[PDB]
Design a protein around this nucleic acid. Sequence first.
RNA 1: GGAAACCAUUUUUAUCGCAUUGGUUUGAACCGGGUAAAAGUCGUAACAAGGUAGCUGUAGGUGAACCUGCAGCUGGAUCAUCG
RNA 2: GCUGCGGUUAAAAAGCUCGUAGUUGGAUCUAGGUUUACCUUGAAUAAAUCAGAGUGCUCAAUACAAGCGCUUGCUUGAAUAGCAUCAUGGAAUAAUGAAAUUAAUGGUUAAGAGGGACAA
RNA 3: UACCUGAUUGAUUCUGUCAGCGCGAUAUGCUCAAGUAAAAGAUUAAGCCAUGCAUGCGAUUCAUUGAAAUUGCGUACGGCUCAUUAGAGCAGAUAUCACCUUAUCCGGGAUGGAUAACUGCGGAAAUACUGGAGCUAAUACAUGCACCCCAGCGGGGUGCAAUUAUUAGUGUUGACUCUGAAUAAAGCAGUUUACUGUCAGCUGACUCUAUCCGGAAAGGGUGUCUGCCCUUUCAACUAGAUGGUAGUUUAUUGGACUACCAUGGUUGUUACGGGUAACGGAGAAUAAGGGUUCGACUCCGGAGAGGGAGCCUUAGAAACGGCUACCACGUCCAAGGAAGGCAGCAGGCGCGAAAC
Lengths: 207, 143, 140, 255
Amino acid sequence: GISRDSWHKRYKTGATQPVPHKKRKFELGRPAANTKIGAHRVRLVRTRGGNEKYRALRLDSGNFSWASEQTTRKTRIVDTMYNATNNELVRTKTLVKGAIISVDAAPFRQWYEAHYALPLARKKNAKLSEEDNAILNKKRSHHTMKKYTERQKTAAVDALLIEQFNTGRLLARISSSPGQVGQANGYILEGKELDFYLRKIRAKKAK
Amino acid sequence: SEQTERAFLKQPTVNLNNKARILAGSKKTPRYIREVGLGFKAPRDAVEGTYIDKKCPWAGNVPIRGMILTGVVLKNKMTRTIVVRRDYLHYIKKYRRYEKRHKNVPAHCSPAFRDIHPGDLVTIGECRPLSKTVRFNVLKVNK
Amino acid sequence: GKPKGLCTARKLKTHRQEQRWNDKRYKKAHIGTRWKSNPFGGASHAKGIVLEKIGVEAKQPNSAIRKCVRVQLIKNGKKITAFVPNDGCLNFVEENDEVLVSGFGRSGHAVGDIPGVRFKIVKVANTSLIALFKGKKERP
Amino acid sequence: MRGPKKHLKRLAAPSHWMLDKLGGVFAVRPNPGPHKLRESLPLSLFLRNRLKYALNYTEAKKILTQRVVRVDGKVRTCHKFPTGFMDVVAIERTNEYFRMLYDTKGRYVVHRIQAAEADFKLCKVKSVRTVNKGVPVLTTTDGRTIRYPDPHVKVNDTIVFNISTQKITDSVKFEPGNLAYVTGGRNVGRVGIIGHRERLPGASDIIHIKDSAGHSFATRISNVFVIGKGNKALVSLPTGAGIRLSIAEERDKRM
RNA sequence: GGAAACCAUUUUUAUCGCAUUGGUUUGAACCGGGUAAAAGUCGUAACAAGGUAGCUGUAGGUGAACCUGCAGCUGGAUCAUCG
RNA sequence: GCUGCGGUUAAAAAGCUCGUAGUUGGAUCUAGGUUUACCUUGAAUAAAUCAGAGUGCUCAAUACAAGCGCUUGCUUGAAUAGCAUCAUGGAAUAAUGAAAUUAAUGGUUAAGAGGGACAA
RNA sequence: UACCUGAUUGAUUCUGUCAGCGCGAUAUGCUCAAGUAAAAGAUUAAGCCAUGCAUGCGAUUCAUUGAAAUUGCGUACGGCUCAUUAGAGCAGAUAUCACCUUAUCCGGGAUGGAUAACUGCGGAAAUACUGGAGCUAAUACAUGCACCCCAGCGGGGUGCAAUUAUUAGUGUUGACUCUGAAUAAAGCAGUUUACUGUCAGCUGACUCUAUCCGGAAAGGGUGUCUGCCCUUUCAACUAGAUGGUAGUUUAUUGGACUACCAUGGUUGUUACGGGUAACGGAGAAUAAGGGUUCGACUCCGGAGAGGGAGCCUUAGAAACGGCUACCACGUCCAAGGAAGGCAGCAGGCGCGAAAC
């Protein structure tokens, strides 16, 4: 079937190569997973040596990571924004490593407010809902408040990240290979990487 | 300048986004150098540099192991790749004499070596397959 | 003169190979058409079918009629002329007989005063010509 | 082939086993285990040739099925078990103890030892690492892994291993001036004092060893096995003391 | 929730069709070359100044060898000829 | 025909010259009183076969055995020799590199090699 | 044993070949006291094959010691042949800091429901064909028995392996994005003995079976350097071709494949193409020395099982004494269907000079 053999190619000099043998099992390939956004669906693949791989055909929830804050939350993949390889993957909503996607911001906002006890760019005219109040205006002893006061010292969040949080969708990049590990774990863009990908997206939208 | 591709390239083992550094305002991006070894010194262009190349022996992830060879740069027309010509003499017993032989060894030339020209003597270290034909990395330019 | 330098091995080897082809033995043994040209196809003997009996005038200064036979080889269907040695042995050979044929001794060249004959008969009807001549065996 | 090989032709068998050429088509293939195929000896062969206790290879299995042979303090019943260098083989029924050592030629011999000697053995530290849970271990060249070794033990060193207690007793350091055994190469079976060490960084280091007879010889570090501090061997040695007799000297000694 | 037949599509892709192309072998009217073969026909080209010295290249012609023109060579039949 | 052939007449010097690859290239740096190439020595280097040590298979080709006491045994042989890589030492030969505040500051000679100039 | 002899002439000396002469391989003629070792359908037809054999042996025993059957393990080794094959394959050195592993070594981790044998009912001309009905087991199948956060009173989480990200720097290696230590989620489907026989005196000791994690060993896949036939009546070749980035696939690296981009890569030091009556090597014949020729063939490596292709099972196969199809060629049919692969041993036919 699909093969990964080096023969069947030309040589450095452009010569045709001799075929050494019939196709061997240990040099086989398999069809690509081509993971898409949708209800969870992961099939099991038996690999060489009895090991196993997890071919993710459909995925919706991704276990993403915020690096600057050093945390990891499970959010949901909303849409695909940019792909360096090809635009067809973006347009068909394909989840491949290194793909830029839009994820839910609410889990990260909840973690931030439960960890620093400060708002994350909350709306300038809207009162916090009851679930927010349960973690924001909660009241506990000064012994505990000491911990939160210490952590409030280092709490500035970049303006470019705040703008994304306002829209409620965060630009993330997939750092795993869904076709091999069966998951779409990634990390939230920030800094020069975020600026780079934002500029790419805006330029392509302008065109 | 360093970012001239369709994707953002960064050294994988460097956290460009660290809260302490960002709050301090430090624009000094840490750089990872792996110190190839075998008595090979990281070029200053590799240590203090902004280029990203995953195949550089120092700024990349290509361990050097196997054979250390020497040759003369033949052509530098590929992207970060050069062709090294190795000249030797082959002995034919029957005639008790030698004959000139040669072999071309394509090797990856890290952007650290910016002054590379056809004619310069180079040392190359064996690495894992980097491409169809490249399996060596330039380590030293003796010029 | 030949090259004598310390780094002339390639020239010496290539020249030797180039000039080996001007050697009859080497060319005869490596030309490539040996099997398709040699009637026996590189074998020592070959079985064939007798087509007719012919007489070949001996070369000068000799005078005689050498009793040869025309044979068609089974393995490739090629026609050859073979000598029937010994005296009165042409009688043992009848037309449409299966004969074993061997070379005449000089590796594809005529022998003695017989012109153009390079083969001789060894067996007729699976019987040795020498045995028939000596009377050891009789015609099947 | 299409998978692992299970046979071993007689002519492909290691020469140092000293099998006879016309003694059948096959030879006992050692199982994988503590020692390498080329540098081991099937327990079947040990009884068949070196000891002569078994006349044929059915008799070797009959002997070994009785559970009468102990290797490194454990009973072995497989006739294809790969006994190798510095292995203590104990036959309790006959109260015999041997240590598998190399002859000056480079062949396994029958070195009979006493109980005190049999209580321990030497191993070469092949690696020193840290397993899960952050606990140190050292791996020897015979496959053993020992947890919690003395932190001063490094690679290439020799460790005295107590078969009874399964513990490290002493550590001899691979440094110039210590007695050393040669296990591989053409100098196999020779014993001397470590001399100079050529430090080849990306290759195998070279060790020069001078014996008691003043003869010098080099080898690769992977073939050197320290067997004592200074000049004193921690274990006994077979008749010869690892002295490579010249070919003329051998004839003179025989006569 | 598991699941057989079945349907659709992707991939590996045997195999069959034309078509093009490479390599081997081979029929054939007829037209020629070579060689071999005791005693065929025609002449006399060459070997002596071989009876027109021989030969090289070239061109033309003639039953055939060959003849002739032009320029060379001596492997010539002259190592030489008097100022 | 490398060792090791032949080319006037026996087969064989291109009609002649220019010329790239190839091959080959003058002498010269411590005598006296940085790189290579090369050589020496080691390391790594399956048997069977070949060479070769031992050993009355009755000899031999083979084979790898066996030989001693006395019984519960001792001692044995199954040797040794047989491009590339690494290291060590050697510095002739052959290539290759260096310079156009003090110091001798730094350019071998000019081929009975070659080129160019000048004379008549 | 570093060797020659006959033959051109009326005679001579040369050049030069032919012939003789020594060994070996194959075939063959004539002929062969007893014995001892011992090659042997390679050459051509990897052509075709009648018939026999060549792969079978802990848990579960209501049959009669152990049948039958269900499990488990093996059948990927061993045997054969040399068609293909000329950066293929092999030999020596050498990586895997780019990977995968049953068997073997060292460390560490007394639950329920159904199915066969068996009984019974059947179909088919015909297979090692099978559908229903009634029981019944398991080593089959299923289930499984000091630091972080919130709050320092107290609550949670933290086994091995594993995905992603981040923190400090407990061992190593020439060097590690390796191995350790931490932190965060989450899903991941693997795993931390409901086994056999038990023995000794509530306390002990074993065999077996099952089972993951780490390191070895053994095996394998790939990578690097050097060498390895003839040919110019083959001089230019190459377009996934050479490289870059991002991905996909794989056990893993890699134009292995895809998207975008650049125009590269080999070559008179012989590329590219063609031929090979070409598997490579260890080696064999001959043999002063230097060599010439050969090597299908018992050992090592590779390849194939009529030609291709595809896959199931598995630790391991692109297996063929496994399956699936097409091509070529066969076999049995009651014409509805069912099958086959001796380049395993022995035999047969063809082919041949040539082999039990």
